[PDB]
Every structure is written in structure tokens, then in C-alpha cells.
Design a binder for this molecule. Structure first.
Ligand code: SF4
Ligand code: SF4
Ligand code: SF4
Ligand code: SF4
Ligand code: SF4
Ligand code: SF4
Ligand code: SF4
Lengths: 763, 170, 763, 170
């Protein structure tokens, strides 16, 4: 074994020092969802005004505990996914298959960073899952009444849950990529079609919803073996679609499976009537699917123990009997946990069900729409019950005259939750009305998205290191998370295009990749075909599902390893400090709603990676924000001599929520600045940040001068006027005969300086 | 018009304590009696009518503006003192009594809210009203429960009329 | 290996049939604690009127999910406790130590029933914890948004979490009893002093709060080795008191440690100033102990990673330095995770701190009480904020005249939650006022409690079998749970005395045993001295901490194995059916508040054991109640021939809540009746049930005639009058010359009949 | 006094939907207009000053009584039709429209609550009001949020005076 760091297999106590060091600067800000705690029967306790309950826990402790519970729930859903996938893979392919990921010296940066192990076979991932489970259990034991009382150890345990979540995601992704023939660090992954307008109603259509791909692989194996690829359409919602589109795609051949959309599309697709059978696996699946499929005669087949849906368990019955029972209407679906029989039942069920249910949908006709629109009274309940705050009464009133453009506009912003329909005393299917009004847009809804490339190889990172140093790549922008967007699915596209035009590195994943790939320019090209898919400036790469997010974070770890020679094994604090002080990389979850997104964000924070969330994420009850005005907060140590060093206030947050995509763009541009940047990197980052601020907020930033330590730290195009602004408004002394800053900056420039947040790394 | 209290309906509630539904006279008095007020403005003010109404309100009583989000371009040409700040940051800073403020003269005691989303401003006020002593007046369309005082649920024309009647009593 | 049942190492799918069979009769009843769901940022969603949220989950699904989360939280806190304790035990003693627990053919009935494993060494419990952990993770993954939709599959997963919790408790108790020298099936466990008046203020006082006795074991070792037993006082709150008392008590000698009380006493003792040092470990610890010890100069030392309390981590520092820092007031405590250093620091800290904090307490003097009582203005906020609904304003008004009897009455009912003080604008320490008013009662608060006896031996069960079948023992009453009582800590004592006088079998555990042992009769004797402590009629036995509850249910399993020769290995359905149809045992949690109590109740339900909980438990959001009026609900199969058989409606619930202890007594007496009873057992059960109903409700039960198949099924002393009541009100034909029932019973008597709920168990 | 609506304060809330605070006249009208009412009493009715009030109320309209808990011994002497039932069992049965009832003549439409605990009756009503259509009138001294209509927060003497007024107006 090689050199091991101070923290192998961390626990709550083992990472407390680093977490408290982080919280010293980036203090937690709690935005509680309630004023009450509803945990034990001593309550519910009122905690308004930071009052304490019957157990002594105050409002801040309750908010921290709620966020910690969210984080551990997300960590438990990637870990359970990882364990189930790894167990199936070991059962099928054997437990001695060498890990096949690509071309990198470090295969599993997250696993090696946390546990210190260096796996080489699929059987060597088994212990890591045992650890990830064991610690997880301990963490859940803290949600009990009477456990941790302080609100800071809850935050520390949340960061521990985040890093464990990243480890579980890495394990799952490695297992599936090694076994199921996913692309291996391919910078030329095949382009797959996305959108509701891709599925063809002529052929039977199968819709797979969930995250696991174990059963979908059997389904597509049966479809290929029996030659039904051209006679049947297969589509996926959520990340399971990405998993199908990566399956057996290392040959760089276009696939036949199609991605339908994100979670917000699910009900809409069900209301369209296009699906002839819906097979659900587990995570991110609407709970009212049978309640609509029974009306539209769409069978529902469950394939997981996590989500059985209260359906009859026909695992031991014959496929023909189940097909007959579903055909004759006895049951609306079934639980079929046997993958071999499921992979035959699903396509056969689609084939035998398509002719009997063609032409049935919930979309109203012209006269039905006219009557439904004329039925409304404008009572305002639907607008109150809309999560996205959509002007539904105004849209309906405009549609009364015959102006159906308002509902067409509302279609993009709506997330298809039908929560409005349950508060309408007139019983108006508002979601169906909006869908019918946007029928044309739905028909012309197509796009291209690049398949999951896997993890970033060492060669690409090494090539991009020079670009980062020489000030040609301003930074790294990751666009991940869910699809609970506040203003439709175009904001992610706008942000990605804006940052790609400025030669950033954009890495996407999850539903955000789907919604980015749904829009084209005048030439009818998406971003994926407009920009290359490598890891370099001006390129947008797709890692795949949420379990590939680890790769993103993992990439940052390799930057600390392959460039500074740092040891990865069990060295979380050192690598996190390096990443926080030197690497300019920001994540963005514009529509995060699920606990998986919270766990991913917390794990990214513990690795030193700041993230910007959508406004809805303010309901997560925790952010990490720094006090810019407090000059004593921004002080570090010098690794050369142990001296006290000053750093500019960047990044100014670890987790914060933006409100509009323009503010998000400005924040992402600003928070890519790091204290270790050389002159060229600082210059390009300042140029882009100032230009974006002028473009979107209309003013020059009020704190830009905090990042100007050298005359070569200013934009080339606007250097002299910025020097004049420094001299006149601040009194800095500038050598006007040499265009040099004589004096005035608080922090001098020293590229050889090594900032650090850990005292034990000095001298 | 004058009535901004007849509708205080909500979908979900944060708890027992809720903001008081006030009238235009009370809102104008509270704005005009504050020792150090701050006009926290979201990007919903970009509506032209709300834009000039907010500009007139800020001009009448010399109230500094915190243009959260991307609402700054609506104040570049108007002769007011508006500065950009993140709403989640601003809410964090308000709970600290040692924060110099947007001009370095100290913290504020009363904030005025106009042109936000009812799920974001409510989340920020959840921290502000529980971990500080800053009072909030919501002159927006929606009934903000987490404020200290707020308008009722009004339509666009009703909101415009209420803002006008406030501006005349300012 | 031997015979294995159909369900070894169960999962969610493997126990769905038995869960659905149980839910067919005992339907779940949901009593939601809230009208909103707040799990993801799509919400909070209003679900009033059984409406669905943005994910499609309705109100019933949300209530089921909340109860499932409570159950898995409790299961995770006994499992984490078990893993930590077992790891420490293996590290100290080695993993090849034989499991010695007493005289029983089956050592671990729960483990053998669930996993089908026969562990013989402490290293053979390690895999079982791995399973208990691993499945646990999957269960937590269901708490996510978009997971299982139907509420019935949430109830099934809750039952799975309950049985897993029982397995974890069994592992915990096995390890600790084997290693730490606890009594092993000992029917002569030593008596232990309990109460607030036991501790002596003239000596240094250590107070241990927690559940595990790993560090306090080192503390006691240091105290004994250095001969400080007679120079100091050591007391325990919550289950750690029971565990520290049982420590090294195989010799049947009286311990020197004392038991202070339950959780409701914690703050009270802190307000008394009697403790000189407080050491906190884990579950059931108030979160404001430091906030009071700062005022009263009481150091608080943490000893677990679960509960660190935001204190400085001085694990690697010298004990003398920590003692000096605490003495000089720099810090109010520290995290001391090193057991060897903690076991020395705690007694030394108490010795060095006792002389410096004598005579300091929060209890007011006479003039201060006069002022505080005269300050109140009777605004009614404290009564509103009181969890137990106490008439505090009336008590204070009565005390204004000098009548302090009302507060003395209120002292027993209060639970030490300080919630009133936070809503008093006059700033009156109401809890301190009540404590001072009841100082005289507190001074004489003493009692005796029998130490934890471990698990019930085989010989005692075999001896009691004859008494059960010859109508000598009416049934088994388990009294477990927490101390969130609605009317003080005397109702449990009254129930236990009432059922002990009628020659039931009473088994106690947890805080309920503590509160039973606190009351005496005229002769000044507790129940533990009035009745013997072995498994026999009219005897009360104590199993110890709630981790010993796995013995109680476990005992029931042995009843299936010993007498019917049933195979235990992986046979949950068969053993549960046997217990539900034949064993007359019922449990009672009068003050259940924590998630551990919910998990224990659910696990007991999955084993066929009905439970009655206190009224506060209605906040658990789920009960299991049967439809007595639905005659088609009560039908079973006959094992001899597969025919349909009718059974009387007993038990009528699997888990319910009562309002007063008299109703609880009536319900417990009624629900000990089982279909597979001979004449004598049914007769004695009916006699006791009818007498208790007449005594407490004042009327004869309206459905007694349902449990009458034979003239020998009636009470001996009231046979002819009941026969007349049957004849004149129902039309039954009775042979008045032979005192025999000719016709009228719906269900005939057949002692050879074998009722069952599983058709696969028939011919 | 007669008000019974002047105080509707709560410590914790179940949601935005609350029971309506009614007066004695409205309560008497609702009780005397119901088609099939049930008087669900708890142990708190055992007070020698409330038990007779409850008996008079039941006698005025011949309302059958469900004596939940251990309140049955207070109705043996009085010539009323009182039957014992578990409160949780009663709440479960009320949601079933196929339950014959305490006399076999079917289910009930409205229930009257007196003498319960604020945290137990609220929990039972949390199921009754969400999974059925049975209306509830609370004539207790605590403001029951989960009922359909309920008295305010009253003192003991005020509650007894209000009960007397309801009795005289029945
Ligand atoms: S956190 Fe959610 S469930 Fe708990 S009281 Fe608040 S709204 Fe109700
Ligand atoms: S956990 Fe604490 S705050 Fe929450 S209900 Fe229980 S006693 Fe109250
Ligand atoms: S809830 Fe129905 S009736 Fe009311 S405004 Fe909305 S669509 Fe119209
Ligand atoms: S379905 Fe669409 S319009 Fe209706 S409430 Fe949900 S998001 Fe709003
Ligand atoms: S989990 Fe479902 S019900 Fe709960 S807040 Fe999210 S969308 Fe609403
Ligand atoms: S809250 Fe204080 S002032 Fe009000 S009644 Fe209670 S003790 Fe008296
Ligand atoms: S401390 Fe006691 S009296 Fe005060 S609110 Fe809590 S339980 Fe009631």
C-alpha cells in the first residue's frame, strides 16, 4: 500500500475539523419551512422566534436536522441504487471483472479519496458499499428525538452524508459502465433524439420511468433478439432514458431508444395517450400513474421492490396469463420482479395492447375546449395552488375570446403536476387545456442530446491545464440537477449558451442535459452539435445520469492529483482545500427539488466546489454564505512559512439561490475567481465577470477592485479607463508613464504563494 | 382599491403566526415613520407600471433601493440610489447587527417588499423574521405570511390602484 | 443445517403476503398530524380532503410514509446502538466468545426467526448486523420523492422495519449480556434504589444520560479500582441507568449505582443542582442541558459521535488540562471519545468540581416564590403551550393565596419540558415554581426496582404452559415504552397492580419499570417486593432497557417452538400466525413518544402481538383496527382439512390507543382472548374481562356472548345468571336441568381445531 | 360571556383550514337541526358540574351518547341511551358508510364533542374530517381546529354559562 492520508473511512468525528473550518468562513443560513416540529408525540412543538421544543432543540437545530434528513435520504437512494445494480452485475457477469472506465491513472477518485482503497475488480467494490451502508445507518440514528442538539454538528453530519452520497454514486456508475458496455471516456458519444415529438404513434410505444436500467436492459435485449426495433418505439423518462441510450454504445453507433423528457413531462405524456405500456422502476416516478392509466387503458408494470405501487404480485405466474388478465381489464398492472419474464412481458404486452387502445387520450377536442374554457368563473384558486405561480385565470379569460396564446406560453412554464385541477370547483382539466393549446409546439418538440461520455480522461485534463493556466479557459461550469425550473426549461439553455460563447468548460448531466438539448438556433442546430463534446474550452460534454455527477466532482479531485502530485488516498481535507483555493469550478442546479440534488450539492461543498441553486431550492432550509464585509473572515495560512495570508473574497458562497438566469450567470462568472490565479487567468475571469455584469445588471460591479492586485489583472480592452477609475475613485497610485500600478492594492501579487486553510500543512 | 384586506387566503401555512393585513393608510404611515427603511425590490418591478410606481415611492421619501435579482437595469437612468444585492445574501446580512449596510451607515430596521415571488420572499423572510428584529411591509400583490405587515390578495389593476393611493398619502 | 422456512432474510417483497393478510382484517387507520407535505421543493403541498400533491401522493400515502419514516428511524437507533456496542465488545473481548444467556434451547429467537441463523459466537452476529444495515438502507431509499406510491406498501415496509428493529435489539442485548456480565435469565435479580431522593448531596454526584454503557463501564471500573464507591454517588437517567445497574450483577449482589428517573426528570434534576457532573452519550438526551449547566456551573461531557453537542473535541488532550479549563470556566464541557481517558476524567472532574458549586440551584426561595407567584396576571399562554394540558393559571392563582397544593399536584403530571416558560411574558420559571412547591414530595421520592433479568428461560415457559392451558393464568401483559404519560406516572403502576392481583403475567421494561417501582402501598413496599420476579402467574419480571424488549416478543416465539414443535428458522409467517391465533399476550406503551416505541410496536404487530398505547400515540399517524361488525372479516382456515372456520372477534386491534388507564385495563383484559382456547382459559379470561368492565365502565359488556361456545365458557360464580341473560335476551336454548347449552352459539367448541390464516399450511 | 368567539388562539396549526368559531345560538340551531346526531363524550364530562349539563342536552333532543374512555359510569343512573366505544375505534367506524352504528340503524351525519382532550380529539378528527363527510360541533372550552364548527377558548365558568345558554335555546 502507498501513502495513506490522515482520514481514511471517515466518521462524524473524523471530518469535524475540516467542516468547522469551512463553516467558520461560509456560515450556514437557515430558512425554515415551518415554525413547528412534528417528529415525536411530545409535539408538535412551536419554535417560532428560535424557541426550543419539549426536547430542548431550537428552530435552528430543527432546520439543520431537516436538511440533514434530506441529505441522508438522497445518499440512501444512490447507495441503494448502487448496491442493487452492483449485486445484479456481480450475479450476471461475475465478481472478478476488471474495472473498465477509460484511460486514467486514478480510476475511482471519490472512492480513493474517501476510503483510501484502490479497487481493481467488481468484487472490490463490495466492501466500499458495506462501509457506505454502515456509516449511513449511524447517520439515520441521529434523526431520532434526543440525539444531536447543536445545529452545527447537524451541518457536519450533512457534509459527511454528502461525501458518502458521492462515493455511492461513483460505485454505481463504475459498476454499470464496466458491465453494460457504456462509452468509456468517449469525446464523440452518439447523439440521441429527445422530445415529445420524437415518438411515433403508428407503432406500439413503451415508456420506461425511473432510474434503474437492470430490467430495461432485458427488455431491449428481447426487442433486439426478436427483431422488433423497427416495429416498436421505446422511450424513457428521467435518467433511465440516459441509461438506455448509453447501453452498448461504446461502438459509437446511434441507438434506437428515445428520451421523452424529464419528470415534468410524465403526466403530460400519460395525458397524450401515446404510451401503450408504462414500466416503472424506482426513483422519480409520479404516484398517480395508475389513476390515469386506468382511464386511458395504459397498463403499468412495476419492476422493483422499492416501488410496487400496491399492485398484484404476478412474479410466479405465466406471461400469457398476465397478458390475458391485463387485456381483459381485470388488473391495471402488476409487479414483475423476475427480469427475464419482464423483458418478454413488456414488449408482448405493448404489441397486444396497442390495437385495442389506439385513439384514446385526455386531450379535449375543439368543442370540448370551448365548453371547458367558457365554464370558468375566474375564482383564482388554480393560481393559488400553482407551484410555479402561473397566471391561469388570465390565460383562461384570454382564451375565452379565442386568444389561446396565453396557454401556449404557460405550457413551457408548467411542470405538469395537476395540482390546479384539484382546487377547481368547476372541474376543469387545466393541464389538458394547456396541452391542447400547445399541441403544435408539442408536435414540433424535437432535439438532439449527446449520450453520456462517462468520466473525464487524464489526457483531456492535462491538455486543459495549460489552457487554464495561460488564461484561455476562464473556468469550469457544471449544469446539473432536476427540472423544477421557475421560468421554464429554457434558462439552462440560455446559461449554457452564454457560457459556451465565452469559452468556458460546460459539463451537463441529468434532466438539465435533456432540457438544454431541446432548443435550436436559426440553423436548426442544438448546442450539442454546435459545440464539440470534449473536455476543453468552448465544449459541452454530457456525463449521463445523476450517478455520473461524481465524475464531475471526481474530475476536480484529479486536478489536485495529476498536477500538484497530491496524495488522494484518505486525504479529504487536503484535496478539498486545494480545490477551494485553486480550481475555478462552479456547479448549478437550476431546478433542484429532490433529496438527491441536496446530497449532491452538499457533497460538492465538502469538496470545495461552490454551487448555485434555483429559487425553489430556498425551501431546502440551508445555505452556506460568507460575510464579505468581515475582513477577518478572509485570512488563510502560507504553506511556505506558516505566515498569515490575505485572499480576495472569492468564492463568496458555497450554496446560495439565485432568482433569475441573468443573476445566475453573473454569480457563476464571479465565483470562478480563485486566490491562486496567475495574471492571465485573473484577467480573463475579471473580463468575463465585468462584461456579464454590464450586460445583465447594467452596472459595473461595486467590488471589482478587490480582485485587482496587478496592472496585468485588468481586461485588455478596458485597461486604461479601469486604471483611471482606480486612481480617481480610490486614490490608488498608478505609474501613468508605464501603465503600472505603483501602490494601492491590499493584497500583493505572488504566484509562488501557497494559500491553505489547514495549519498542519505549513512548514 | 382602498380595500386590501378582504382576501388573505393561502395554500399552505408556515404556522400559527401570520402577518397582519393592513390598509393603504397604515402602509403609508408605516413607510413614512420608519427611521431607516430599505426598499427591497425583485425583478417583478420590471413591469413598467410597477417600475414608475416604485420609482415615485423611492423618490418621495428618499429610500435606498436594494435591487435583488436582475432588476438593476430598471434603475440605471432613474435618479435614485439603487444597489444590487443577492436576496439570499441580503437576508443573511440583515440578521447581523454589525453589517455596515449598502452605504456603510449601519443596519436597517424596516424593509419594504415589492415585486417578488411568494415562494422565495417567504423563504427569505422565514430567516429574517425568526433570527432578527427587522420589520417588513409587503406592498405586493400576494399575501405574504412571513412578513410583519402585508397587503391582501389583489389583482393587477387593484394592486396598481392601491400603490397609487399609497403614493398620494406618502 | 436444519429445516429452513420459506422466508429467510426477508425483504419488502418477501413479507408482502403476510402483511396483506394481516391488513385484510386489521385495516390501517390514518390520523394525519398535518395537512401539508414538505419533503421536496415542489411543495409544501396541501393534501386536505385526501388530495394529492405535485408528485401524485395523497394524504393517506403521506401519513403512511411519515409513520414508515418514524419506524425506520427507531430501527436505525437500535441497530446503530447494536453495531457500536458489538464492535466495542469484539474489540475488547474477541469475537470468538460463546454466547451465554441462560438455559434455553433457542438462544436468539428473533435472529433465528428472521435470518434463520444459529449464532454461537460473538463473531457470528457480525453478518446479521450487515444484513440489518443493508436492508435498512434500502428502506430509507423509499423516503425519497417519487418512490412507492400506495399507502399499503408503505405499511408493509413499516412492518419490515419493525421486525428488523427487533432483530437489532436482540443483537444488542445478546452482545451486552454475554460480555458485560449481566444477569442471565435470573429470576432473583437484585433490587435497585430509584427516585430523586436516593442521591445524596453531601457527596460528589455523577449523572449519566444515554442508552449505551460503554463509557460509563470504564467510569465504574475507575471508581471501583480507586475505591471511590462510598465517597461518590453515580446515578443514571433513561435506559443507561438500567444497563449500568445490570453491569457485573451475575453475583446477585446489590449495586451501588442509582437510577434517578426517566427523561421527564432530566431537566428537573438539572434544576435541582444535585448533579456535580453530567455525562451524556446518546438517544433520549435533552438538547438544552448545557444552556442550564452554564448557569448552574455543571460540566457536561459528551462521549459519542452521535451526540457531540457542539462542544470542543478534547479527545487528544491531557485530562489535567481539561480539568483545569472546565474548573476555570473556559468551556462548559468537551467531547471525550477516548473511553480510557473519559473513565478517569469524569470522576476526577466530579471530585474537583463538587466543592466549588455547593448550594447553587435554580429552585427559588420563599420570598422569590412569593414574588414570582404575585407577578402572574393569568393570561393563559402557559396552559396553551403545555403538552399535558395542565391548569397552570389556576394553580398559580390558588398559590397567590398561599395554597401551594395545586402546584404540588401538578408536579407529578408535568414532564419537565420548559415549554411554558418560553411563552410567559412575565418570565416566570414555572417548572422551578412547581418543583419548589413539590420539594416535600421530591425529598421522599424513593422506591425499589428489580434489575434486568435478561431473557425468559425455557423451564419457566414450560412450567407456565400448564397454567395457561388449565385456566390458571389468564394471559400475558407486557408493559413497555416511554414516559410521556397523560396523567402522571401512576397509571402504569395502577394497571400493573390491577393485573398482578388477578394472577396475570406482567413483564416490564424501560422507563415504565422505573415509574412502576416508584410507588408503595401502606406497608411501604413496592410491587417488586410484593410479587416475585420470575416468569409465573402473579409475578412481575423486569427485562431491563428497551433493547431487552426483543426478549418479550422473543419469548412468544419460543412458545411456538417449545409446545407445537414449529420450526423457527426463517418462518416469520407461520410463527406469527401461531402467536396471533393461540397466544394470549398483549403489550402496553402508556407513554410512547419516541420512534423506538413506534418501531417496537410495529415489530410486535408483525409477530401477531396486539398493543395498546397512550393517547399521545394518536400522533403516530397510524393504528391497526378491525371491523367487528363485518362478519366476513373474521374467517380462517382449518389446518386439518382446509375448511373455512369462524373465530370470535379477538383481538379486535393490532395497535390502538386508549384514553384513561381504566379503559386501558378493560381493553388489555378483553384482548387476551384467542380462538384456540380450551374451556378453562376462555372461562377465566371472560371472568376477568367482565369483572374489570363492571368495575371500571360500570356495565356488562355488550358483546360478551360472542365469546361463548360452551356452558363451561362462563364465569364459575356467575354461570346461571349469565345463562338466563343468554336465554331471555338472545333466544338461546339451554338445558336448564343439566345446566347445559343446547343451541345458540354461532361457533361450536372443538379443541382439536387448528385455526390458521395461511392456506398453504392446510392439508 | 355569550361571545365564545373572542378567543381562537392556538399553539400549533394543522394547516390553513380551521373550524369555524360559532356562537351559542348557531350551536343550538346546528344541534337541533341535525338529522341524526351523536353525542360523543369523554372522561372530562365526569365533572359534577358538566355531567348534568350533558345529560340535559341529551334529554332535550334524545341524542344517543357514545361514552368514550371511562365516562360510562356517569350515565348508568340517568335515563339516557349511552353506549361505550373506543374513541379511535369510533373514528375508524365513522368513515365507513356501511357501519350499522351503535343501534344498527346506520351511520351518523353530525357529532357533538364535549369533555375531551385537545390532543386526542384533534387527532381523531384529523381522520374523521379528511376521510369522511361527518360534521362535528365542539361544545368544549378549547378551540378544536379539526372540528367543523367549535366554541372558542373559554374559562370553566364561562364554558358552563355558554352550555346553559345552549340548553335554554335548544
Ligand atoms: S414540517 Fe411539514 S409536516 Fe411538519 S408541521 Fe411543518 S408542514 Fe406539517
Ligand atoms: S422532537 Fe423535540 S421539538 Fe420535535 S416534537 Fe419532539 S419534543 Fe417537540
Ligand atoms: S379554479 Fe377553476 S373556476 Fe377557479 S379560476 Fe381556476 S379554472 Fe377558473
Ligand atoms: S399542473 Fe401546471 S398549471 Fe397546474 S398547478 Fe401544476 S404547474 Fe401549475
Ligand atoms: S414529496 Fe410530493 S407531496 Fe411532498 S412536497 Fe414533494 S411533490 Fe409535494
Ligand atoms: S404565561 Fe405567565 S403570565 Fe401568562 S398565565 Fe402563564 S404564568 Fe401567568
Ligand atoms: S414544563 Fe411542564 S408545565 Fe410547563 S409546559 Fe411543559 S409539561 Fe406543561
Amino acid at each position: 500500500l502507498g501513502p495513506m492520508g490522515p482520514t481514511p473511512f471517515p466518521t462524524a468525528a473524523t471530518v469535524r475539523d475540516w467542516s468547522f473550518t469551512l463553516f467558520d468562513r461560509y456560515e450556514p443560513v437557515y430558512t425554515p419551512m415551518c415554525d413547528q416540529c412534528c417528529y415525536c408525540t411530545f409535539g408538535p412543538c412551536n419554535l417560532e422566534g428560535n424557541r426550543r421544543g419539549a426536547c430542548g432543540l431550537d428552530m435552528k437545530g430543527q432546520a439543520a436536522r431537516e436538511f440533514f434528513l434530506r441529505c441522508i435520504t438522497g445518499c440512501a437512494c444512490h447507495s441503494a441504487h448502487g448496491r442493487h445494480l452492483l449485486d445484479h452485475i456481480i450475479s450476471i457477469f461475475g465478481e472478478d471483472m476488471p474495472i473498465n472506465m477509460g484511460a486514467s491513472n486514478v480510476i475511482a477518485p471519490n472512492i480513493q479519496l474517501i476510503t483510501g482503497r484502490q479497487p481493481k475488480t467488481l468484487g472490490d467494490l463490495k466492501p466500499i458499499m458495506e462501509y457506505v451502508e454502515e456509516e449511513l445507518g449511524q447517520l439515520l440514528a441521529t434523526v431520532h428525538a434526543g440525539q444531536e442538539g447543536a445545529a452545527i454538528d447537524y451541518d457536519n453530519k450533512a457534509m459527511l452524508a454528502g461525501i458518502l452520497d458521492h462515493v455511492g454514486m461513483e460505485v454505481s456508475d463504475i459498476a454499470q459502465v464496466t458491465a453494460l458496455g457504456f462509452p468509456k471516456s468517449d469525446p464523440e458519444a452518439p447523439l440521441v433524439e429527445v422530445g415529445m415529438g420524437t415518438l411515433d404513434a403508428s407503432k406500439p410505444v413503451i415508456i420506461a420511468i425511473g432510474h434503474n436500467v437492470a430490467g430495461v436492459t432485458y427488455i431491449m435485449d428481447y426487442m433486439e433478439d426478436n427483431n422488433l426495433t423497427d416495429k416498436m418505439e421505446i422511450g424513457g423518462l428521467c435518467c433511465t432514458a440516459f441509461d438506455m441510450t448509453r447501453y452498448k454504445r461504446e461502438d459509437r453507433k446511434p441507438p434506437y431508444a428515445k428520451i421523452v423528457g424529464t419528470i415534468s413531462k410524465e403526466l403530460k405524456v400519460v395525458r397524450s395517450g401515446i404510451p401503450d405500456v408504462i414500466v416503472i422502476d424506482e426513483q422519480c416516478v409520479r404516484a398517480d400513474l395508475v389513476e390515469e392509466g386506468k382511464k386511458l387503458k395504459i397498463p403499468v408494470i412495476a419492476s422493483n421492490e422499492k416501488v410496487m405501487y400496491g399492485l398484484p404480485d404476478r412474479t410466479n405466474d405465466d406471461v400469457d396469463a398476465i397478458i390475458e388478465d391485463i387485456k381483459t381489464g381485470k388488473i391495471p398492472g402488476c409487479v414483475m420482479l423476475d427480469y427475464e419474464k419482464l423483458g418478454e412481458l413488456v414488449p408482448r404486452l405493448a404489441m397486444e395492447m396497442a390495437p385495442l387502445r389506439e385513439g384514446i387520450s385526455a386531450i379535449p377536442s375543439d368543442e370540448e375546449m370551448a365548453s371547458l374554457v367558457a365554464k370558468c368563473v375566474a375564482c383564482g384558486e388554480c393560481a393559488l395552488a400553482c407551484p410555479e405561480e402561473l397566471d391561469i385565470p388570465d390565460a383562461i379569460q384570454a382564451a375565452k375570446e379565442g386568444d389561446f396564446t396565453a396557454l401556449d406560453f404557460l405550457h413551457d412554464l408548467c411542470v405538469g403536476c395537476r395540482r390546479c385541477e384539484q382546487v377547481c370547483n368547476k372541474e376543469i382539466p387545466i393541464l389538458s387545456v394547456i396541452d391542447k393549446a400547445a399541441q403544435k409546439a408539442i408536435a414540433e418538440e424535437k432535439g438532439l442530446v449527446r449520450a453520456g461520455r462517462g468520466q473525464v480522461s487524464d489526457a483531456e485534463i492535462r491538455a486543459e491545464g495549460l489552457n487554464l493556466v495561460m488564461g484561455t479557459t476562464p473556468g469550469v461550469i457544471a449544469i446539473i440537477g432536476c427540472a423544477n425550473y421557475p421560468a421554464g426549461s429554457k434558462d439552462v439553455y440560455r446559461i449554457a449558451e452564454e457560457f459556451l460563447n465565452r469559452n468556458y468548460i460546460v459539463a451537463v448531466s441529468g434532466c438539465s442535459a435533456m432540457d438544454i438539448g431541446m432548443y435550436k438556433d436559426a440553423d436548426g442546430k442544438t448546442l450539442y452539435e454546435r459545440f464539440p463534446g470534449r473536455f476543453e474550452r468552448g465544449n459541452i460534454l454530457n456525463t449521463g445520469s445523476c450517478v455520473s455527477n461524481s465524475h464531475i466532482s471526481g474530475t476536480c479531485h484529479k486536478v489536485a492529483a495529476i498536477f500538484a502530485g497530491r496524495n488522494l488516498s484518505g486525504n479529504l481535507a487536503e484535496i478539498a482545500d486545494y480545490t477551494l483555493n485553486r480550481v475555478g469550478a462552479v456547479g448549478l442546479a437550476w431546478g433542484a427539488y429532490s433529496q438527491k440534488a441536496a446530497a449532491i450539492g452538499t457533497g460538492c461543498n465538502m469538496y470545495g466546489i461552490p454551487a448555485v441553486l434555483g429559487p425553489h431550492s430556498g425551501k431546502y432550509r440551508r445555505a452556506l454564505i460568507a460575510k464579505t464585509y468581515d475582513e477577518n473572515k478572509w485570512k488563510v495560512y502560507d504553506s511556505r512559512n506558516g505566515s498569515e495570508l490575505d485572499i480576495p473574497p472569492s468564492p463568496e458562497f458555497l450554496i446560495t439561490t439565485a432568482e433569475t438566469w441573468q443573476e445566475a450567470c453573473v454569480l457563476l462568472a464571479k465565483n470562478c475567481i480563485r486566490p491562486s490565479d496567475n495574471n492571465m487567468g485573473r484577467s480573463i475571469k475579471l473580463t468575463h465577470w465585468i462584461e456579464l455584469s454590464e450586460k445583465y445588471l447594467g452596472v459595473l460591479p461595486e467590488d471589482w477592485w478587490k480582485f485587482v492586485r496587478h496592472e496585468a489583472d485588468l481586461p485588455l480592452s478596458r485597461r486604461e479607463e479601469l486604471l483611471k477609475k482606480l486612481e480617481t475613485e480610490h486614490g490608488w497610485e498608478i505609474d501613468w508613464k508605464k501603465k503600472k500600478i505603483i501602490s494601492g492594492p491590499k493584497i500583493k501579487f505572488d504566484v509562488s504563494s501557497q494559500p491553505t486553510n489547514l495549519k498542519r500543512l505549513c512548514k | 382599491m382602498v380595500d386590501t384586506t378582504k382576501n388573505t387566503k393561502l395554500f399552505t401555512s408556515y404556522g400559527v403566526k401570520t402577518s397582519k393585513a393592513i390598509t393603504t393608510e397604515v402602509a403609508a404611515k408605516l413607510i413614512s415613520k420608519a427611521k431607516r427603511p430599505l426598499f427591497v425590490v425583485g425583478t417583478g418591478v420590471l413591469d413598467p407600471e410597477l417600475l414608475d410606481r416604485a420609482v415615485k415611492i423611492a423618490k418621495a421619501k428618499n429610500i435606498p433601493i436594494a435591487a435583488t435579482g436582475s432588476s438593476m437595469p430598471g434603475f440605471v437612468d432613474k435618479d435614485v440610489n439603487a444597489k444590487y444585492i443577492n436576496l439570499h445574501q441580503l437576508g443573511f446580512y440583515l440578521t447581523d447587527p454589525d453589517w455596515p449596510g449598502l452605504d456603510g451607515n449601519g443596519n436597517y430596521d424596516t424593509i419594504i417588499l415589492l415585486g417578488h415571488k411568494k415562494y422565495y420572499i417567504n423563504q427569505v423572510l422565514s430567516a429574517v423574521k425568526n433570527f432578527s428584529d427587522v420589520k417588513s411591509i409587503s406592498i405586493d400583490r400576494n399575501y405574504i405570511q412571513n412578513a410583519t405587515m402585508s397587503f391582501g390578495n389583489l389583482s393587477k389593476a387593484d394592486h396598481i390602484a392601491a400603490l397609487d393611493e399609497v403614493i398620494d398619502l406618502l
